Ligand binder design. Structure first.
Ligand SMILES: O=C(O)[C@H](Cc1c[nH]c2ccccc12)NC(=O)C(F)(F)C(F)(F)C(F)(F)C(F)(F)C(F)(F)C(F)(F)C(F)(F)C(F)(F)C(F)(F)C(F)(F)C(F)(F)F
Ligand SMILES: O=C(O)[C@H](Cc1c[nH]c2ccccc12)NC(=O)C(F)(F)C(F)(F)C(F)(F)C(F)(F)C(F)(F)C(F)(F)C(F)(F)C(F)(F)C(F)(F)C(F)(F)C(F)(F)F
Ligand code: HEM
Ligand code: HEM
Lengths: 452, 452
């Protein structure tokens, strides 16, 4: 019999998600119940997996395909049949997949590098210009950087986040829509007139996001600057299989999708990485020494970023402990037996609980809570399906190399140009908005006074 | 019998200042009544002068000395015996004057230049980074620039105004204090319990300004870097006459004074200059041609800024029409007859209405409202005391060379790097906060794509 956490009569397990930190709650449940537990709500069931033993079966694409979790079905209200919220079998998924993969080729990535540097230099200059005793609001500045990077690299659009003391309106609306989706999970009678205003606000925030997408497309339309970026591929690329391009409706959904997926989780990653660095000073020193050794020019080169091996290890270890898109959903393609123990029928759902997978002591050893970048000295040594911060198979993250190149560049420059102080002895507090991010994480920087 | 505008019974002329635009109202009164009129309030009188023939007499320092207008007396509540709000006969006036005069020498200006460029480059980069069809909020960005320039050049303190979409809190508090003082002029029964909230906010706004001053001082003493800026002279300079340095209390007053006087009127100047340029495209062409011909390096030099003659003529003509500190006050040192017609007793007050002086048709010709920089092409041709945007005599603006160097550099770079469009066909609306500035002035820039 499958373990199951505590129930609330007719509501079954649903009230367990009536919390501001649902993923962290599910992790605690996994600690108590083990590698698999059933989670029921009125009218639905899923099974949360936490061991590599079971997740390696879940990642077999002949047996399971990507499912849209409840969260993703609600995000689909604004993300449509964009890549993240489309089913594998929808024509627009494989079309967009084939059309946009070229936007993340090696040659594309080399092409984005200069614009990544543009935004990174803005970050470095902001911090150089701070006065004595001033501090840095880490997740806020990381969100400024990542949003601006996807906007510029992807769409030749400048959000100019470093010119604002508040979040860009896009961010404010995105955040409000995302945690409104985190709210809709735990609810009942959605057509209740009580939520007429919540729907009005949801539609308002969606309109804000779509108005900006309108601007991006119109600006490209009127331009004559010869762009060869993500939007270029959206507007002109043809799917080799069907021979078709994307239509205008799908393009709008892809823009929204990439603006959100293309920064939020990267800002979390950078925030967690800097957190672990300041909490582990020997690791910080080792990373700083690499940055100084490798980044010998005022502008980092593409090749130099690729040579930041230890900074890459730091980022992977941060993703191990706190993968910022912490779960993904699967359904059974056919009847099948999971783990030689659990019979599933076609259509049965699974949730992969990534932070728990990443704490599987049979894979990582007993010290799973310790921050040790050296675990990733040779990424080849990690068993298959043991480390899954970017999902699985053909439905894995399309932007993984983009995110990692950006984060490595930025963290490298940060470690080259400043020493960091955990001046408040910050107590980790992880805010959940579907994605994960340190809340209230602040540091002080002291410039090493190296020119740009 | 001296002319006098309309009266309001026992309140006399006081309610004429109960307007958001008191200087402009006084200008209209001057147009109606001529070169001199009496202005009375309960328990006080002054005489407003508008002609060069009477103002030249008023500028005779053997007969008249600087007076603190009622406005300056209320500003003195936070500016103390700083240079702007001290009487000539107060020890701390000549003392501070002697100590700080060398901080505005050519040797000093050459010293500030690099930091002026620092902030100007931030301005240019902001505008380069705007998207298609976005516009510029002119007085807002000019205030960002001028505040940051005096902060950095004067005090090695970065307000980082370009990192904010709202004004720096210092600005918010400064403006509230200034317009309170303007609004406190027109008040009858100022101790009415209705104005208690206004008194409470005024004291809060003073506290904001003083905390910022305390931080500037604290930073300097803690700092280990070698500065030789305005603050260095305030803290270490000795007056050659008395042999004394400034005491701590006076230094605080000077910092407040220079932060306010050292940026507000310069932001107005730059805003009016750009307004007149976009309203006079042939003038804009001449100024842009000069900027292109002279500013041949990505980083302008001090020598190149001195070479921008036409840009200087533009700024002077903007100061002719809209001098941004639009009046100054004098008192009669002894009994004397003004203009062979108006007998004055010792202590009698005069107000010099600078915008009206600058429209004296007997001096400038009949076309006084037209924007023609060429009036300043042969500067000795301007009669004595006909052009007084920087006040008079030993109580003249100590920062004139700073303001003009900054404004010439910045306007030069603006004209080098962008074409400008008056896309809204903006209707001049002058906001008064004691000082004058266009309100709601917006333009679009098109980059000339010249690298920095
Ligand atoms: O939605 C579900 O089915 C279950 C909770 C659940 C289980 N059973 C239920 C029954 C009724 C109601 C809810 C449940 N959700 C989760 O466990 C979960 F962890 F919250 C999630 F929903 F899985 C998730 F991890 F938060 C998440 F939403 F998928 C996610 F990973 F954070 C994510 F939001 F999708 C993302 F992938 F992280 C994302 F990046 F934020 C994103 F939403 F995909 C996105 F990229 F931003 C977007 F795609 F752009 F939105
Ligand atoms: O204050 C007065 O005595 C008369 C009005 C008046 C006349 N009679 C009165 C009787 C009762 C009450 C009021 C009156 N004031 C004006 O006519 C006037 F034009 F508003 C003004 F006050 F002179 C003035 F122009 F605003 C001003 F005071 F000169 C001025 F603008 F404040 C200024 F001095 F020019 C100034 F330089 F701009 C400034 F505002 F003071 C200033 F420079 F910004 C500053 F605030 F002093 C500084 F920034 F701190 F330096
Ligand atoms: C640290 C950074 C990132 C993390 C942790 C992350 C994580 C993930 C995960 C877990 C998935 C699979 C979701 C699922 O199966 O339901 C995914 C898919 C995706 N990611 Fe990311 N991602 C990151 C950065 C980015 C960036 C920078 C982009 C774009 C520039 C992006 C675009 C996408 C897209 C489009 C998909 C959907 C792919 C498809 O199904 O066809 N991601 N990502
Ligand atoms: C366009 C810009 C400026 C204008 C139009 C302007 C105008 C004036 C005027 C009219 C006065 C005389 C006031 C009176 O008689 O009551 C004055 C005095 C003064 N100005 Fe300015 N000014 C400008 C810029 C600056 C700057 C940049 C600074 C400082 C960096 C500054 C500092 C002062 C000081 C300290 C005084 C008082 C001088 C004294 O009495 O000893 N000004 N200014």
């Amino acid at each position: 019999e499958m373990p199951q956490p505590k129930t609330f009569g007719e509501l079954k397990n649903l009230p367990l998600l009536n919390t501001d930190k649902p993923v962290q709650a599910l992790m605690k449940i996994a600690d108590e119940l083990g590698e698999i537990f059933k989670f029921e709500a009125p009218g639905r069931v899923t099974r949360y997996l936490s061991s590599q033993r079971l997740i390696k079966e879940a990642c077999d694409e002949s047996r399971f395909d990507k499912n849209l979790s409840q969260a993703l079905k609600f995000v689909r209200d604004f993300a449509g049949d964009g890549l993240f919220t489309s089913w594998t079998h929808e024509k627009n998924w494989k079309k967009a997949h084939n059309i946009l993969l070229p936007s993340f080729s090696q040659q594309a990535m080399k092409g984005y590098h200069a614009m990544m540097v543009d935004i990174a230099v803005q970050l470095v200059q902001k911090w150089e210009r701070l006065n004595a005793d001033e501090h840095i609001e880490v997740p806020e500045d990381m969100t400024r950087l990542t949003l601006d990077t996807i906007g510029l690299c992807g769409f030749n659009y400048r959000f100019n986040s470093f010119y604002r003391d508040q979040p860009h309106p896009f961010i404010t609306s995105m955040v409000r829509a995302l945690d409104e989706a985190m709210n809709k999970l735990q609810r009942a009678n959605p057509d209740d007139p009580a939520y007429d205003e919540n729907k009005r606000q949801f539609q308002e925030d969606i309109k804000v996001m779509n108005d900006l997408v309108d601007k991006i497309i119109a600006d490209r339309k009127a331009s004559g600057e010869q762009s060869d970026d993500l939007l270029t591929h959206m507007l002109n690329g043809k799917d080799p299989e069907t021979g078709e391009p994307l239509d205008d409706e799908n393009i709008r959904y892809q823009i929204i999708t990439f603006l959100i997926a293309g920064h939020e989780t990267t800002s979390g990653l950078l925030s967690f990485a800097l957190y672990f660095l300041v909490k582990n000073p020997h690791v910080l020193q080792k990373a700083a020494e690499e940055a100084a050794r490798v980044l010998v020019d005022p502008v980092p080169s593409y090749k130099q970023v690729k040579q930041l091996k230890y900074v890459g290890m730091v980022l992977n270890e941060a993703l191990r402990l706190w993968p910022t898109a912490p779960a993904f959903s699967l359904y059974a393609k056919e009847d099948t037996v999971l783990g030689g123990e659990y019979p599933l029928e076609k259509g049965d759902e699974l949730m992969v609980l990534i932070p728990q997978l990443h704490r599987d002591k049979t894979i990582w050893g007993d010290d799973v809570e310790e921050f040790r970048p050296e675990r990733f000295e040779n990424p080849s040594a990690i068993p298959q399906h043991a480390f899954k911060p970017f999902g699985n198979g053909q439905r894995a993250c399309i932007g993984q190399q983009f995110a990692l190149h950006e984060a490595t560049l930025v963290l490298g420059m940060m470690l080259k140009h400043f020493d960091f102080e955990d001046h408040t002895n910050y107590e980790l507090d992880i805010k959940e908005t579907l994605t994960l991010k340190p809340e209230g994480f602040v540091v002080k920087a002291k410039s090493k006074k190296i020119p740009l």
